[PDB]
């Protein structure tokens, strides 16, 4: 294969099989990791393996990952802007403050079973 | 592990108490001022009369 960077998340095929989450394109500065004292941005859902963490390597950064039936996010040392989508195809944006916890639809104000569309680092 | 989770719940409870105590302190000062003002108003009224 050609050694060309296509910005497609490395190992995404394996992750889909292992954690149940799927990943697409990003600017390469966010990696999926374990949740064991190394937590940075943490995503909770009721599917796959329940949760997983991401590590920010540099700012700004983003990764358009998809996580079905997401309901909560933890932030750390940084504001996180999050895009989620409803079952009717309508998308909205939630501003999560640093070092705090926020929720989505199901654990938010609407109760909707929303999906995580984009995770962006300020 | 358990003593740390228990510690957190006590710390949270203390924060609540501290905030309520703060307000009571303010309430006491307000009432004290209201009583002083009433006293002064009474003396002013006594002077007027």
């Amino acid at each position: 294969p050609q050694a060309v960077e296509d910005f497609s998340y490395p190992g995404a095929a394996k992750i889909q099989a292992e954690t149940g989450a799927i990943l697409k394109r990003g600017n390469g500065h966010m990696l999926m990791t374990s949740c064991d004292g190394s937590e940075d941005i943490q995503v909770m859902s009721r599917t796959g393996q329940k949760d997983f963490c991401f590590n920010v390597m540099a700012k700004p950064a983003y990764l358009t990952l998809e996580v079905p039936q997401a309901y909560g996010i933890w932030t750390s040392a940084d504001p996180v802007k999050t895009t989620i989508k409803d079952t009717d195809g309508t998308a909205t944006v939630i501003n999560a403050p640093a070092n705090d916890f926020t929720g989505y639809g199901e654990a938010g104000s609407t109760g909707e079973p929303t999906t995580l569309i984009e995770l962006r680092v300020a | 592990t358990g003593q740390y989770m228990a510690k957190r719940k006590d710390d949270l409870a203390d924060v609540h108490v501290n905030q309520v105590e703060r307000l009571l302190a303010e309430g006491s000062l307000i009432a004290a001022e209201a009583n002083e003002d009433a006293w002064r108003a009474t003396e002013a009224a006594a002077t007027a009369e």
């Binding site: 294969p1 050609q2 050694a3 060309v4 960077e5 490395p10 600017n27 390597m57 540099a58 | -």
Partner: protein, 221 residues
Amino acid sequence: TVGDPTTDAKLDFTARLTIGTDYRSCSGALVDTQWVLTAASCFADDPNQPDTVAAGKPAQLTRATVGRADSNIANGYVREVVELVPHPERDMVLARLDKAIPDIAPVRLASDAPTAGTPLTAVGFGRTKDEWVPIQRHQGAFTVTSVTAGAVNVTGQGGDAICAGDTGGPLLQDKNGTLHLVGVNNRSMQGGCYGSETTSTDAIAAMSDADFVTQTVNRDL
């Protein structure tokens, strides 16, 4: 390319380029203050078929940063690519910049090919064993296994395979402090990379072409 980080002024003639916003990215190196040499496949619609990479303006806005060993600092120069001059036979393209960078010297070109057993080095901005995108550029070590028709076959020494984002990156051979460009990385097995696995560390690079560069860089004397 998996090895120690390096920011020393021995390999400050290297460059990193991005095509579009998030379309394609790869490595390169200076041959002049106005010219940067990289792979043609970086500008192809189909990376495995660099036949349609015609001469002229880039299909998408392309920018390059030169000498910026560490991406978290402002050190280095930023230039836009205005014209491309593809090699008539192999996967190699010369990128013309809008403005020169007179502060950073180019790398000298090799007079001939390395032979099997020759110790080569390589530097680039591609993936590492544990990072999708690095902060600093890294230098690895490779050996020549064979030489073929206009290309050189190499393998990683003690691991250290050519991975991804290394396309267009230089292959170097030094002697007595002088560095010569012997080829340009095109394809690799990508073993020992973040997010993937394979045993092989083999890679292939286009052979450096001094005449191609000379008749392009000095085309308008």
